[PDB]
Structures are given as C-alpha cells and as structure tokens.
Structure 1
Amino acid sequence: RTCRIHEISCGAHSTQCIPVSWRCDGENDCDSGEDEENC
C-alpha cells in the first residue's frame, strides 16, 4: 500500500501499483482479481 495519489495498490502481501483508471475497468489488471470486485 501507500503508493502515489494518482494510483492505488492492489495487494497486501505483494506490492503492485496500478493507475486508478485500471480500477474496475472490466479487466483483471492485477495478479489477484481485486480490481473487478465489488464495483
């Protein structure tokens, strides 16, 4: 966690910053599909 404001973090054990635009965009942009959960 604790990445740049322009982006989020999509992992707890592992660090992976993705831009906010990738959050709930209809595709799994992370290793764990938590971008498309609870949209």
Structure 2
Amino acid sequence: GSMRTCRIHEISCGAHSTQCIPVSWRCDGENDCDSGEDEENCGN
C-alpha cells in the first residue's frame, strides 16, 4: 500500500517509491523523480 507519506508540502514521489520532492518541483519540466510521476498529468 502507501509507503512513506512524507511531510506537509511533499509530493511523496510515487506511492511505491521512497522519495520526497518539494511541491515547487511539480511540473517544473525536469524529471526529478525516478518514475517521473511529478511530470505526469501536467498542464491543467
């Protein structure tokens, strides 16, 4: 299930990955996460 729900303003970087990226890194144009979930479903 959910692994490591991280902190107040993290993204948890995938439900099955142990990574925390700040919210400022979401849809920044860079694949910070290994899975790249941060760049998925961009452009609302």
TM-score normalized with structure 2 length: 0.72
Specify every segment of 5 or more residues in structure 1 that has no aligned partner in the other structure, as ranges.
none
SS class of match (1:10): coil
* Greater share of residues in strand: 1
Count residues with an aligned counterpart. 39
Whose radius of gyration is greater, 1 or 2? 2
TM-score by length of 1: 0.79
Superposition misfits of 4+ residues, deviation over 6 angstroms: none
Whose helix fraction is larger, Structure 1's or Structure 2's?
Answer: 2
What are the ranges of 5 or more consecutive residues in structure 2 without an aligned counterpart? none
